[PDB]
Amino acid sequence: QRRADQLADESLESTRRMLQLVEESKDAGIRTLVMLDEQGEQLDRVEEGMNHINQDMKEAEKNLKDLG
Amino acid sequence: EFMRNELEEMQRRADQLADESLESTRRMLQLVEESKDAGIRTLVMLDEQGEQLDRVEEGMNHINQDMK
Amino acid sequence: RENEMDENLEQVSGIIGNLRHMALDMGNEIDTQNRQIDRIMEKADSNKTRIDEANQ
Amino acid sequence: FARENEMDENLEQVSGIIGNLRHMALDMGNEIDTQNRQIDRIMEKADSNKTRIDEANQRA
Amino acid sequence: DIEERGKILVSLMYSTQQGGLIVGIIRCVHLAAMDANGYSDPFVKLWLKPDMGKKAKHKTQIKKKTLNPEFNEEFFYDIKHSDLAKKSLDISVWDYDIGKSNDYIGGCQLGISAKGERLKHWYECLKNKDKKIERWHQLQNENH
Amino acid sequence: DIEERGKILVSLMYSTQQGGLIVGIIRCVHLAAMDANGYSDPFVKLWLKPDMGKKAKHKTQIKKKTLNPEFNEEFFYDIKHSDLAKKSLDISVWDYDIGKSNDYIGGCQLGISAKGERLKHWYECLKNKDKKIERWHQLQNE
Amino acid sequence: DIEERGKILVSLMYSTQQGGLIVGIIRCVHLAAMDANGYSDPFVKLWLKPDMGKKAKHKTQIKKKTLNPEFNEEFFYDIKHSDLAKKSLDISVWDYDIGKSNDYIGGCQLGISAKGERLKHWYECLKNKDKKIERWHQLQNENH
Ligand SMILES: [Ca+2]
Ligand SMILES: [Ca+2]
Numbered sequence A: 001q002r003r004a005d006q007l008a009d010e011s012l013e014s015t016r017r018m019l020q021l022v023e024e025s026k027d028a029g030i031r032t033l034v035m036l037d038e039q040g041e042q043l044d045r046v047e048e049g050m051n052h053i054n055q056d057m058k059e060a061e062k063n064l065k066d067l068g
Numbered sequence B: 001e002f003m004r005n006e007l008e009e010m011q012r013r014a015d016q017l018a019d020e021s022l023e024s025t026r027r028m029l030q031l032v033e034e035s036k037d038a039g040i041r042t043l044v045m046l047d048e049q050g051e052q053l054d055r056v057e058e059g060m061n062h063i064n065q066d067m068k
Numbered sequence C: 001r002e003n004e005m006d007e008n009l010e011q012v013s014g015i016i017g018n019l020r021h022m023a024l025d026m027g028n029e030i031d032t033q034n035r036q037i038d039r040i041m042e043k044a045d046s047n048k049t050r051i052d053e054a055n056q
Numbered sequence D: 001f002a003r004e005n006e007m008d009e010n011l012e013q014v015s016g017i018i019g020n021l022r023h024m025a026l027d028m029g030n031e032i033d034t035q036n037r038q039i040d041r042i043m044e045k046a047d048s049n050k051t052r053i054d055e056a057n058q059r060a
Numbered sequence E, G: 001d002i003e004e005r006g007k008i009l010v011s012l013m014y015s016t017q018q019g020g021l022i023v024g025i026i027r028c029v030h031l032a033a034m035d036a037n038g039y040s041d042p043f044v045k046l047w048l049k050p051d052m053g054k055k056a057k058h059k060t061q062i063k064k065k066t067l068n069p070e071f072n073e074e075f076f077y078d079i080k081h082s083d084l085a086k087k088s089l090d091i092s093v094w095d096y097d098i099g100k101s102n103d104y105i106g107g108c109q110l111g112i113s114a115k116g117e118r119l120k121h122w123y124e125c126l127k128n129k130d131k132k133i134e135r136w137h138q139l140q141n142e143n144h
Numbered sequence F: 001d002i003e004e005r006g007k008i009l010v011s012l013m014y015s016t017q018q019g020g021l022i023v024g025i026i027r028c029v030h031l032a033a034m035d036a037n038g039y040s041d042p043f044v045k046l047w048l049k050p051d052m053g054k055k056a057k058h059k060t061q062i063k064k065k066t067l068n069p070e071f072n073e074e075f076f077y078d079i080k081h082s083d084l085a086k087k088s089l090d091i092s093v094w095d096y097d098i099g100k101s102n103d104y105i106g107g108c109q110l111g112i113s114a115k116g117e118r119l120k121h122w123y124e125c126l127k128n129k130d131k132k133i134e135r136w137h138q139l140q141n142e
């Protein structure tokens, strides 16, 4: 007669647990972003480091062959 | 000086080129080791995001199937 | 004395070589999850309307 | 007492967050792509710099 | 009434000048009165777990006979931005007693292990460098 | 203090049957001599930090008169895999002595906050479930 | 005492192929006699310093009853071009006696520590590499 009233309880429990799983995945997304932000910024420190090292090796050799 | 002054510079600068070579091998290994370990921290948090997304998809599929 | 310089430059090479594969394995992994999210929102939009139509 | 409004607001959040999950996951793909290209770029500097270091200690 | 535990307003900022993370504690709201006079004597105890030395733990001043205190203090941590990700800040709230062992009002946490508002506070702090992010946190049980 | 402190063979595996992480301490090699007789009597102690209670710590039997022992023992940490990346496995290799406080040779802490070869072992345990990964570790601590 | 100690013709050349300093002991003239026959038995002892192991010292072949020696010999030093400019090449002539220790007749120190014609001779060897230059230096009293 009214099977939809029982189905309303089943589907209501289906909606409220779906909040948890996506919000848990949203936390996982935030967690995975935190390390990628660091990896991105640390990979910029490498580039500038590698540039700074290259200029110092130039500066090193250029200082020798200034004074003969 | 000036004969001594020119000679003393030639060592100072020549020895510095050897040390700037030695120091430059260390700067790279230090900065590169950090990107090695930073990238593992992203890979740990990726797989946790991937398996949590598996729970979402499993959670979705179930409440679609049983509802029919 | 300066054998450190040899092994440093070898280790820098060896790390960076596999540091490519770290990015490739990240690149392949983010693809499978991106496909997985598209599967979910087709299922979530369908399950939304199927619940909404049942409540009418 | 209530009109049964939990279904409507919960499902709207589910669609809201899944939307954020899709765009958040795509923004990683651009960050991983650029980093992949940066790692390759750093590999050029390393090979180039090792040539300078190998040329410095071998001056004769 | 176990439920009336309270709320706490936390502030965070990584200073590049100073070279560290500054945890600011401004005030609590409606803390659990765990005395024999319908009031409390609260103070906040911070702990940046796990691998930190003698500068891991810090504590505020003790405010007495009030459930809505006024700390307005900040504490410095000599930490690197790269190393700051993996740490966690266990913000605890205690009721002080001179005569016997102290009573536990409530507690909070901030880190990668945390969830929701706790996680989004820790996320925005690391992303937005040289920026003061502040938001409330509802107090939870069982930090001893 | 001294360079040649020793290498410890450690193995990890998350067993979904037993429902937890199983640390398998196999053996150690080239330990620092910290006795008058010129050998050691070592035993390894584990500690999975920090929310674990009575089953946080695990001890090992004391071997005798050797800087190259042979343990062959496996312990069992009952823990859900979902919560595993939060934790840290503090492995401490000591040297037993009778009439005073035990000397410390060196140690190793595995986890997400670890570096170099220690961080890789822990990641390769997380990824490869029900699979045994056995890697050596250097002993470097206070 | 003994003002006329004589003098020595010394050459200096940095080889690129051999990779070091070539020190030639060519001639000596009018050296100080310290025997009962008005002659000496001289030989030129070299000593480069500091931080030279077994390659530091060298000795010429002995000459018999003469105050005008004819050596014509060369001595090689394993040393880098820049590293040589710190050093001091001490050159010393000694009267060889069979019964007793060797009497000191004269010496001469080349390098940055020295002055005058001794300084420029070290300078012009280094600043004009792969080129032999030869100059006469006066023998003196120094660490007999
Ligand atoms: Ca109390
Ligand atoms: Ca009190």
Ligand SMILES: [Ca+2]
Residues within 6 Å of the ligand: F034, F035, F095, F096, F097, F103
């Ligand atoms: Ca001992």
Ligand SMILES: [Ca+2]
Residues within 6 Å of the ligand: F035, F040, F041, F095, F096, F097
């Ligand atoms: Ca012992």
Ligand SMILES: [Ca+2]
Residues within 6 Å of the ligand: G034, G035, G095, G097, G103
């Ligand atoms: Ca004599």
Ligand SMILES: [Ca+2]
Residues within 6 Å of the ligand: G035, G040, G041, G095, G096, G097, G098
């Ligand atoms: Ca004689």
